[PDB]
Design a protein around this ligand. Structure first.
Ligand SMILES: Cc1cc2nc3c(=O)[nH]c(=O)nc-3n(C[C@H](O)[C@H](O)[C@H](O)COP(=O)(O)OP(=O)(O)OC[C@H]3O[C@@H](n4cnc5c(N)ncnc54)[C@H](O)[C@@H]3O)c2cc1C
Length: 295
């Protein structure tokens, strides 16, 4: 029974910030924060792959109240402390330029979130989303293709699969399939949750594969900067082979633009066996096994 819209924007849950910690290490590009919120005093429950809304304070340029922005939940259903009391987000401060009006422009909700102080009250809505749900089958294979904050739902899956405290809390979900995260960020300091992702791979080398595309540190075979599409091309046959399994699910998450390259790579692999990827993919989407969340 998937929880949905336990809180709506006309009457959101007022949560309290517990912590706000930086995920981008020194020498990284930009600001991405792990923000944990207290859910006690309300009934907001959620599952892995879902999102919540945050309503920032203030009015827009037209004097109208700011509307919610959606953020993929970055914590498992139990929260980071496995106490069912919290929810966490993985929020990048949006910044861009020109041509324009002024200089650097800062996104309203993301700046609010990335600078929020512990103790602050936050308007939270949701949860929402049924497109990024993890299968209950402990034998499923799970391919995770993420860039930047697209890591968020992947963390919910991986923590539930691989954290000691999660395994203890979830007797009915003892993961024994194969998971493969291909994660594209510009620098090593930008590898969000690097230490924990690497701890998982070290502990579960037969159940979790971790592949990085680090654009400022790595070049693809054509001499271009390395992106997630390049790693998918590099492993296209293996990925296609995994995708052919009736129990394999694929998840794609992050800023828009990565899908075309991923499709081209898998299209070339499937074509070798006389399969039209775009058609096979349509069928996968219909079966709930091809999960995309780009923004
Ligand atoms: C399902 C879903 C899940 C999401 N999950 C996350 C997440 O986990 N983490 C996260 O950080 N974000 C996530 N987002 C994006 C998030 O919802 C916000 O859109 C983002 O944080 C920016 O909102 P803001 O209020 O800071 O910017 P706003 O003040 O709302 O400004 C956004 C506007 O800025 C302009 N703009 C944006 N980018 C550029 C650009 N590069 N160049 C020129 N103009 C630009 C556009 O006009 C855009 O409408 C998710 C979005 C969706 C839909």
């Amino acid at each position: 029974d998937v929880p949905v819209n336990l809180y709506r924007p006309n009457a959101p849950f007022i949560g309290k910030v517990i912590s706000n910690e930086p995920l981008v290490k020194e020498g990284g590009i930009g600001i991405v924060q792990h923000i944990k919120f207290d859910l006690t005093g309300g009934n907001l429950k959620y599952i892995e792959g879902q999102s919540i809304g945050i309503i920032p304070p203030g009015v827009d340029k037209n004097g109208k109240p700011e509307k919610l922005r959606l953020y993929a939940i970055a914590s498992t259903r139990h929260g980071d402390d496995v106490d069912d009391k919290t929810i966490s987000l993985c929020v990048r401060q949006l910044e861009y330029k020109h041509p324009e009006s002024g200089e650097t422009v800062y996104g309203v909700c993301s700046t609010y979130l990335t600078h929020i102080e512990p103790g602050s009250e936050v308007k939270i809505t949701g949860p929402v989303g049924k497109e990024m749900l993890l299968p209950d089958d402990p034998e499923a294979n799970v391919i995770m293709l993420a860039t930047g904050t697209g890591i968020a739902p992947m963390r919910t899956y991986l923590w539930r699969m691989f954290k000691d405290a999660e395994r203890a809390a979830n007797p009915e979900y003892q993961f024994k399939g194969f998971s493969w995260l291909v994660f594209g960020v510009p620098t090593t300091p930008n590898i969000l949750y690097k230490e924990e992702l690497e701890e998982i791979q070290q502990k579960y080398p037969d159940n979790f594969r971790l592949t990085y595309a680090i654009s400022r540190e790595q070049k693809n075979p054509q001499g271009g900067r390395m992106y997630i599409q390049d790693r998918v091309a590099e492993h296209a046959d293996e990925l296609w082979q995994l995708i052919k399994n009736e129990k394999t699910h694929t998840y794609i998450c992050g800023l828009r633009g990565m899908e075309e390259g991923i499709d081209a790579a898998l299209s070339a692999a499937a074509a070798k066996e006389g399969v039209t990827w775009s058609d096979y993919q349509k069928d996968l989407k219909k079966a709930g096994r091809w999960h995309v969340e780009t923004y």
